[PDB]
Paper text:
Insulin receptor (IR) is a receptor tyrosine kinase that plays critical roles in cellular signaling, growth, and metabolism. IR can be activated by two highly related ligands – insulin and insulin-like growth factor 2 (IGF2). Consequently, IR-B has an additional 12 amino acids at the C-terminal helix of the alpha subunit (α-CT), while IR-A lacks this segment.
To reveal the mechanism underlying IGF2-dependent IR activation, we determined the cryo-EM structures of full-length human IR-A and IR-B in the presence of saturated IGF2. We expressed and purified the full-length of human IR-A and IR-B with a kinase-dead mutation from HEK293F cells. The 3D reconstruction of class 1 (determined at 3.6 Å resolution for IR-A/IGF2, comprising 16% of the particles; 3.7 Å resolution for IR-B/IGF2, comprising 14% of the particles) exhibited a T-shaped symmetric conformation with four IGF2 molecules bound at the canonical site-1 and site-2. The site-1 binding of IGF2 is mainly mediated by the interaction between A- and B-domains of IGF2 and L1/α-CT and FnIII-1 domains of IR in a fashion similar to the site-1 insulin binding. In addition, the C-loop of IGF2 also makes weak contacts with the α-CT, CR and L2 domains of IR. In contrast, the site-1b interaction in the structure of IR/IGF2 complex is mostly driven by the salt-bridge formed between Glu12 of IGF2 and Arg539 of IR. The buried surface of IGF2 binding at IR FnIII-1 domain (424 Å2) is considerably smaller than that of site-2 insulin binding (681 Å2), indicating that IGF2 engages site-2 with much lower affinity than site-2 insulin binding. By contrast, only four IGF2’s residues, including Phe19, Asp52, Leu53, and Glu57, are involved in the site-2 interaction.
Author numbering:
A (entry chain A), C (entry chain B): 1 to 161, 168 to 518, 528 to 541, 545 to 573, 577 to 656, 691 to 717, 754 to 907
B (entry chain F), D (entry chain D): 6 to 32, 37 to 63
E (entry chain C), F (entry chain E): 8 to 29, 43 to 62
The structure:
């Protein structure tokens, strides 16, 4: 839908709510809105005010100490988009010292075209962490939200969610504006074109919200431009773009220019026309033509001067730099001082970089986020007419991240008067400063203590003297190092090389953990001897990043370093497979588990595992298990630097004074690409000795680890211990019963004893031990002294597993 | 090529050779040997002038 | 004895040994000896040269690259004492690049009055660590002996020793000069007066060595002065002291002055007389009088000017400063640059400090050992006519230990032109520099970047703003801290306090281990809230050193610190006495040993130890010990700093834009002052439960530790287990023998069983178990079925300790 | 006594009180409030001049 | 440190003044003594 | 490191060149490779 209402260019409301009635008919604001400094107000005075008509804010919204305000959900229920044409300290929405605020309430905010949001020192506001700024802004990292109620306190963010949720780091979370409304999140197929409540994509030109999808006529905010409600991406003539958000007929711009001309308002601009744009003033190369408002190109190279108040300007924010947008010649001096933490290269290049000549000096002080001065795209000459105090034209102080000053493969520079000045630039180096001096042409305009040697690049390896490595080769466990010798002009100043080495997982490692070792300088060969060094201890088959750096006393500094060279250690014999556990589930199936060794030290080609058969313990055969006690098992430096310098300075004194001018085949299997194994075909109730070992190399000889010993025992069968065969008995003249029974040739390990229970009708049960020797020497049992009658005989076989089943009652009749 | 302490003596007694180094009396000039050959490059004549007889 | 021979003033030998014959008649040298630059020499050319006459060297001895020399024991066999009047780079004996030297050989060196010894880069010399420089020099720490054969190699220092030995650090070692001679060490009663071979003390005036003890007439070197052999401490007139080692008649000095006057030697001095001293020139305030050689005081304040070559002078050694001795006005500039490691304050004050005015500038660069500039005792005015490059009059660069500049309670200063310059003085602080500026009077002569704020005193706590502690009290385990609040002029710059605490064994601890903890700045009270802090974890009863230091951002710096306040934690309950071991040696004596607890936490007043009696184990009575199995027991930050600064700089921008101008009694004993105890009166073969615990406080309630339980068992008696009383037996009709015997009422613990062995004549021995129940229910033993005849009965009692002695064979006759 | 950001606002609206702070138009002077009262000490008149009606 | 065991800290920092219960401030976060002084009220 | 075990290092730094025995330089001191290269002579 269209915007019915006065555009009402931006204004500010202060000191009384009676001034808030100017927005009674306002759908758009061609300016900035500032509601701030409210002291004699109460929350009871805010329940009535509401502005459903407000849709779009061009510049920014600022709220500062408005007492009695608890939520904006009743103030701006239709704030859709903020253009952010001009920001307030590179912030498009500032909420500062917002006492009594509880929830933001801006449940209709969709997009912020340019800028960031800074909300802090509210002490009462929550419902902040439950929002998704990614769908709202374009650079979340530029936000600044601290010192609210959210962090120091624990105001519960209770809200429906129902409402959409999304991940931010590693977990999902509902995105809600207030306790009744939540952020409108819809599929990414409509990146910024808008989307209705159901989910239909709005028109491509549309932005934020729309009523009828795919219909620009019924939109609420369209990104490109605006005209007569039915906005289009670019309006045709005779409509000229105005303030980058709408276009109007030539008559409007002409009468606005006439109004500013006849009414000498100090803030009005003589608007001109340049490429269908009613801009306040066209850039350099055009002249304001009295006949037609358009400014035709001039027949002369006259630049657009940029006069500065009191000949100075501090660039500390995007809005500070935007005042110089379109300017090309500065009639003053520039002092760049960006106390930040977020880089501003893009916006600085957008606003600056079109300037060519600076009348005064250029000074960069205390700037932090600046990584380079490359945003001065067309900086050519620095006249230095207004010389800086101390007679300087260039400045640099406490720049923590000034890496590169300019790209001198193509760039040009010229300084007329003054001298350079560099101090405390840990990321800037003397090579770039000397290039500055050479290119500028002020070589003979330098003095002592203007470019400190020990402050610039103190933590940046930039001596730009390269060192080669002669030959290196890594052996089975260790590595040897060797490099070409280096010598400064005075060989006594070399105190030895610094060697840096660390384990680099991937091919890229940062330059300047990082364990170091001291190297004694080599003897003066005056055949030349390579210094070299032998390492001590390492973890094999790892990518090691190594480079060497010389260490020379400061007298000029002429050190040297080498490129980061990656050396790969070879492979070795693996360790024991971790956690060897074997479990048996079936009569012939034993499952053994293991983990790869802690240090594989080699691509494990196969596992060589052996299972071996053992005989029963020798002492078991010679132990009787009917004797009582028959428990059968159920089987600091500066001094060193000076000492070199003190030694050196004595020799210089001495020379000056003196000289005056005139296999067992255990079954095995090569387990390949498996940390486990299942073995079949094993005897019942028989133990196994398992020899486990791993190999990581097969074709070029088997490089195998050490053996690991584990014990595995199988469960027995069902009816293996039961005695089979008839129970034959021999009766002598003395009624001696000599029992015959065939032993279980395949028992559960071995049968230790036998239990015979013969009971007569009305008698009781007797017992007798039949040991291995008893079963051997007597060839079974030998019963003596049995009372007359028929006995019911049962025999129990006692094996290693346990007592076997009672045999069926056998009846034998002796004479009465 | 610049030469400094230590090796300067070995360079001497070879460029000079046979004869020694002259010595009359202390009679500092602050320009003896170090700021001639160590700090800055020096030629054969600057070493020859420190001989005794020639 | 006297010195027979020409004094032969100091000379140097170079380029041929044929020049070494000038010392054919020399007992003393009034100068320096330099033997150096020997290339075409061989050791075969040195076996003949010997100078037994040389005794005394005035200035110094220097040897530099003398090829073919292996030992000085044949060159200077009588070098007794070296005066060291003028040194060679503050060294009285230099041995540099001494190739082919093996042993020093100076076995006759006794004393060195002033200077030090530097021997280095010999690569062949040993016999160095086997010497005692303490008895030779006066300041051993000023020596410099490195890069010899002694350290890098292992030349055996085999020598007699026989010869005296002495300690140096913690062990004795023989002090030998060569393989045949050793350092002469004699009792300290003769500190430097000398001592003969036997041990008799020489004359007090004598020095080093003497022939007849307590006789100056027969001395070899006397410390004070010399005349006609029989030297005296101070010669009377008409003898005037000459060169601080001898005195001569006025005629000698007069003719020497005349010889220097008529013969225009460039090095000769017009010697004058001043206080019986034929000095080269008397100091300021006297005039050279043509009539009499003495210089009378003048009627005018004319100082002694000190003209400098090329208007500059580098002070880097004692000999460099000695050239200015006696001077008071310098017609040039002074550049002090002492590359050292040993302080030179004493000698600099001796030579300098008599100067008053400096025509040019004073510059101190790269000096290390200088802790203060106080040696300029009478420095008053610095004219600065010859201004330093850059228009400076005072300089300071890379002074690693410049603590104090001057004592401004009394000192005065005046600078005419130029400006101060301070850079990289970590031990110097801005307070002293501002005092410099105020006292000098050049306050309006300062510019930016002449006194760096972040380099001077960067590691010296000198903000000189004191902080008090409000109240503190330490409890049983922990300590609470509280101090008065502090606020810089801009309260936003305070980022919180730094708290430092460490354990200080003794009352003195160094200022600025040292564990630290961050303190959040207190809320703006605008009643004032004290910040305070609570500690976490400590070791009780320890002297803790605590102080707090503020941390304020660099914008001027207005931090604050507190005095080092020592707080003593109270005492606590001790731990278990370490290593509780108890050993028994006698029947009633048990010795228990223990160590004091690892943390006593209290002065151990006494030890409360209890020994308790126990009963025999209940299951022992119910266990039978004749059953098989009878085994009876034989009982990184910069981001945080900027975040505060970034938050501050946005607040300043907002304000500028918005506002616009118009008990069981177990026997116990209190073991006092003893880590052990011996207890008496204990029952034989009875165990003891020992409850060991310690107390460190008695009168104000017993603060006692936890109990420690140990077990102690006593050895038995001799004949306690033997059965006493007659072996009465009752015989029934069935020949049942019922044995009666009285049990050992006081046994070794308890008798478990009995062994009875009755044997008839020609029969064998029988056995029977008599258990506790068997002995109780049957009231002894009950034998059944004994064959007719007389049996020899023996009874063995089996107790806890073991089997008792066999009873005497008892005979009883049953009917046949 | 010097006052800086944060407490400066509370000092305001009390010295001024009742009436607010005047505002015509932006029309930077680089001497707004910080370098008047925070960096350097400032008196009562320098705060009174920022009122609206008087 | 946590509940029950932590009472000695408020007894330390408050003396004979007493306190009301609340552990959530130092069982998970850190006891900085800032909350402890205000926990006991005169 | 000491004798017997140390031989691998001279084999490492000398290759197929061989060496003569002497351990007193690395069992108590440190192996800086300076002596090791000179220990094996061509």
């Amino acid at each position: 839908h269209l915007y019915p209402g006065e555009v009402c260019p931006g204004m500010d409301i202060r000191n009384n709510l009676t001034r808030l009635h100017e927005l009674e008919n306002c759908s758009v604001i061609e300016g900035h809105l500032q509601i701030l400094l409210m002291f004699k107000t109460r929350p009871e005075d805010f329940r009535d005010l509401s502005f459903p008509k407000l849709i779009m804010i061009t510049d920014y919204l600022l709220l500062f100490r408005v007492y009695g305000l608890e939520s904006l959900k009743d103030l701006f229920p239709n704030l859709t988009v903020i253009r952010g044409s001009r920001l307030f300290f590179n912030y498009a929405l500032v909420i500062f010292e917002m006492v009594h605020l509880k929830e933001l309430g801006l449940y209709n905010l969709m997009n912020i075209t340019r800028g960031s949001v800074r909300i802090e020192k509210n002490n009462e506001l929550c419902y902040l962490a439950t929002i998704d700024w990614s769908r709202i802004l374009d650079s979340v990292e530029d936000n600044y939200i601290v010192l609210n109620k959210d962090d120091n306190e624990e105001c519960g963010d209770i809200c429906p969610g129902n409402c959409p949720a999304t991940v931010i780091n590693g977990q999902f979370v509902e995105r809600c504006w207030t306790h009744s409304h939540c952020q409108k999140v819809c599929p990414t197929i409509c990146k910024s074109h808008g989307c209705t409540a159901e989910g239909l994509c709005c028109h491509s030109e549309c932005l934020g919200n729309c009523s009828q999808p795919d219909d620009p006529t019924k939109c609420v905010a369209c990104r490109n431009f605006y005209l007569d409600g039915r906005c289009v991406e670019t309006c045709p003539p005779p409509y000229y773009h105005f303030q980058d958000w709408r276009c109007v007929n030539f008559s409007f711009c002409q009468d606005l220019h006439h109004k500013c001309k006849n009414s000498r308002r100090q803030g009005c601009h003589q608007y001109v026309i340049h490429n269908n744009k009613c801009i306040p003033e066209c850039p350099s190369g055009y002249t304001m033509n009295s006949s037609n408002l358009l400014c035709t190109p001039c027949l002369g190279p006259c630049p657009k001067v940029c006069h500065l108040l009191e000949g100075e300007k501090t660039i500390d924010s995007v809005t500070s730099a935007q005042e110089l947008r379109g300017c090309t010649v500065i009639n003053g001096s520039l002092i760049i001082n960006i106390r930040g933490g977020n880089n501003l290269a893009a916006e600085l290049e957008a606003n600056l970089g079109l300037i060519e000549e600076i009348s005064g000096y250029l000074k960069i002080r205390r700037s932090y986020a600046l990584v380079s001065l490359s945003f001065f795209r067309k900086l050519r000459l620095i006249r230095g007419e207004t010389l800086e105090i101390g007679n300087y034209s260039f400045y640099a102080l406490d720049n923590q991240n000034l890496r590169q000053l300019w790209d001198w493969s193509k760039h040009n520079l010229t300084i007329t008067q003054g001298k350079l000045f560099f101090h405390y630039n840990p990321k800037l180096c003397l090579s770039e400063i000397h290039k500055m001096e050479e290119v500028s042409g002020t070589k003979g305009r330098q003095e002592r203590n203007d470019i400190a040697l020990k402050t610039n690049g103190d933590q940046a390896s930039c001596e730009n003297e390269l060192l080669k490595f002669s030959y290196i080769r890594t052996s089975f466990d260790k590595i040897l190092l060797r490099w070409e010798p280096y010598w400064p002009p005075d060989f006594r100043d070399l105190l030895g090389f610094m060697l840096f080495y660390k384990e680099a997982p991937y091919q890229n490692v940062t330059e300047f953990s990082w364990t170091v070792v001291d190297i004694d300088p080599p003897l003066r060969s005056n055949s030349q001897n390579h210094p070299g060094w032998l390492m001590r201890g390492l973890k094999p088959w790892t990518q090691y990043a190594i480079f060497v750096k010389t260490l020379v006393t400061f007298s000029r500094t002429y050190g040297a370093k080498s490129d980061i060279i990656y050396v790969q250690t070879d492979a070795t014999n693996p360790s024991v497979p971790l956690d060897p556990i074997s479990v048996s589930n079936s009569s012939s199936q034993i499952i053994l588990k293991w983990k790869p060794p802690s240090d594989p030290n080699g691509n494990i080609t196969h596992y060589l595992v052996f299972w071996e058969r053992q005989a029963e313990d020798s002492e078991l055969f010679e132990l009787d298990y009917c004797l009582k006690g028959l428990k059968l098992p159920s089987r600091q430096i500066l001094k060193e630097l000076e000492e070199s310098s003190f030694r050196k300075t004595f020799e210089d004194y001495l020379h000056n004074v003196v000289f005056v001018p005139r296999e067992e085949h255990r079954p095995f299997e090569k387990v390949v690409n498996k940390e486990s194994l299942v073995i079949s075909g094993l005897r019942h109730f028989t133990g196994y000795r398992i020899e486990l070992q791993a190999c990581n190399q097969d074709t070029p000889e088997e490089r195998c680890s050490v053996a690991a010993y584990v014990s595995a025992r199988t469960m027995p069968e069902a009816k293996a211990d039961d005695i089979v065969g008839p129970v034959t008995h021999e009766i002598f003249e003395n009624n001696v019963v000599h029992l015959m029974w065939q032993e279980p040739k395949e028992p559960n390990g071995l049968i230790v004893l036998y239990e015979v229970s013969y009971r007569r009708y009305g008698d009781e049960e007797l017992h007798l031990c039949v040991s291995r020797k008893h079963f051997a020497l007597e060839r079974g049992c030998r019963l003596r002294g049995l009372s007359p009658g028929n006995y019911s005989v049962r025999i129990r076989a006692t094996s290693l597993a346990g007592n076997g089943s009672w045999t069926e009652p056998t009846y034998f009749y002796v004479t009465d | 090529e610049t030469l400094c302490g230590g090796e300067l003596v070995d360079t001497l007694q070879f460029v000079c050779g046979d004869r020694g180094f002259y010595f009359s009396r202390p009679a500092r000039r602050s320009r003896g040997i170090v700021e001639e050959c160590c700090f800055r490059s020096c030629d054969l004549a600057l070493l020859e002038t420190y001989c005794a007889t020639p």
